Write an enzyme that holds these catalytic residues in place. Structure first.
Site, short mmCIF file in Angstrom:
data_model
loop_
_atom_site.label_atom_id
_atom_site.label_comp_id
_atom_site.label_asym_id
_atom_site.label_seq_id
_atom_site.Cartn_x
_atom_site.Cartn_y
_atom_site.Cartn_z
N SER A 93 4.98 -2.56 3.33
CA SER A 93 3.84 -2.76 4.40
C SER A 93 2.47 -2.26 3.79
CB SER A 93 4.01 -2.05 5.88
OG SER A 93 3.04 -2.51 6.65
N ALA A 94 2.44 -1.01 3.20
CA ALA A 94 1.40 -0.44 2.37
C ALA A 94 1.13 -0.59 0.92
CB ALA A 94 1.27 1.23 2.78
N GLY A 95 2.37 -0.90 0.40
CA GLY A 95 2.54 -1.10 -1.00
C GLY A 95 2.68 0.16 -1.75
N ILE A 96 3.03 1.33 -1.18
CA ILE A 96 2.91 2.77 -2.05
C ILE A 96 4.35 3.39 -1.66
CG2 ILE A 96 0.40 2.89 -1.79
CD1 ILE A 96 0.86 4.87 0.73
N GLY A 97 4.89 3.15 -0.70
CA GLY A 97 6.36 4.12 -0.35
C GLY A 97 7.46 3.55 -1.01
N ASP A 102 14.66 1.43 9.21
CA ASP A 102 13.59 1.83 9.98
C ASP A 102 13.02 3.22 9.65
OD1 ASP A 102 13.63 -0.89 10.99
OD2 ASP A 102 12.78 -0.13 12.91
N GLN A 139 5.72 8.23 -0.40
CA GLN A 139 4.87 8.71 0.79
C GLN A 139 5.66 10.08 1.47
OE1 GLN A 139 4.98 4.66 3.05
NE2 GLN A 139 2.85 5.49 3.72
#
Ligand SMILES: COC(=O)c1cccc(NS(C)(=O)=O)c1
Length: 281
Positions: free
Chosen positions: A215-219, A180, A261
């Site tokens: 969730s965002a598709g970047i991290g 998490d 990120q």
């Protein structure tokens, strides 16, 4: 060589500083289609948008928009589609993109719920006998089988085009143990997961690009692609230590903003590749 550069940055604790130079050097391109008012409810975060130049277009005449980017790594002969975790109202769009791009695999790097919030819609069936129909996009999805392991789950699914009665087998690779907060202590389980996706043939040029999301598709999605591409370039090159992970990240950021990120994710990517280089060396 990065192992030495790793110790250097680590011993000096310069990760936040390297990370800031990357932020500064990163490309910035228009995202006009993402920002249209009719697309407002197709985006999960208002600050995470696909560039117009690299955005995936849906083949529906109405609205062709999805928060998805094609990342083309020319030298590595590797493509990836990075997308957000689907919303309740975009699950149909998500499976339409998978259909239209001839993708074999979907790689999921988050849990549906993290930190007591929903990071993602439940976009795949939980039982064999309870299939999902997407009325908007005319697609049926069926769970065929599911292999639950300690760190990840692989789920064989059948995607049926109700319009044409064609079916395809999709593999869902779900990394279930990303913490998490922060990043895994060891990259071992992540590398094992990456090699399982590779073996499946989902990353192979025979197929459409793999769909990768968190969730965002970047991290986390960023770390996945960065590690795959770096390890592959180390096989391909006469000199494996010519591979600069910062250069590779900057090339990928021409295609989608914000890949990696945090400085924590940047450090983990170095560690994953270094350990990756080692396993295959
Ligand atoms: C859930 O079924 C599977 O694990 C499965 C099904 C079909 C193909 C594969 N290729 S693999 C062993 O590399 O991941 C796995």
């Amino acid at each position: 060589e990065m192992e030495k550069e790793f110790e250097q940055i680590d011993k000096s604790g310069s990760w936040a500083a390297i990370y800031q130079d990357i932020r500064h050097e990163a490309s910035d391109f228009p995202s006009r289609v993402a920002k249209l008012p009719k697309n407002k409810n197709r985006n999960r975060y208002r600050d995470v948008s696909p560039f117009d130049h690299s955005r995936i277009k849906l083949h529906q005449e109405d609205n062709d928009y999805i928060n998805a980017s094609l990342i083309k790594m020319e030298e590595a002969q590797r493509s990836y589609i990075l997308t957000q975790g689907p919303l309740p109202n975009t699950v149909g769009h998500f499976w339409e993109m998978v259909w239209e791009q001839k993708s074999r695999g979907v790689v999921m790097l988050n849990r549906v719920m993290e930190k007591g919030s929903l990071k993602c819609a439940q976009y795949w069936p939980q039982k064999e006998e309870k299939e999902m129909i997407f009325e908007d996009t005319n697609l049926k999805l069926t769970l065929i089988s599911e292999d639950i392991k300690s760190y990840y789950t692989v789920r064989q699914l059948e995607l049926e085009n109700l319009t044409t009665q064609e079916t395809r087998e999709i593999l869902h690779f779900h990394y279930t143990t990303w913490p998490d907060f922060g990043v895994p202590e060891s990259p071992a389980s992540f590398l094992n997961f990456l090699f399982k996706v590779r073996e499946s043939g989902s990353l192979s040029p025979e197929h459409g690009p793999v769909v990768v999301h968190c969730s965002a598709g970047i991290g986390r999605s960023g770390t996945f692609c960065l590690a795959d591409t770096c390890l592959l370039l180390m096989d391909k090159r006469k000199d494996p230590s010519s591979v600069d992970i910062k250069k590779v990240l900057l090339e990928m950021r021409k295609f989608r903003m914000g890949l990696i990120q945090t400085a924590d994710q940047l450090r983990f990517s170095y560690l994953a590749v270094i350990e990756g280089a080692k396993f295959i060396m």
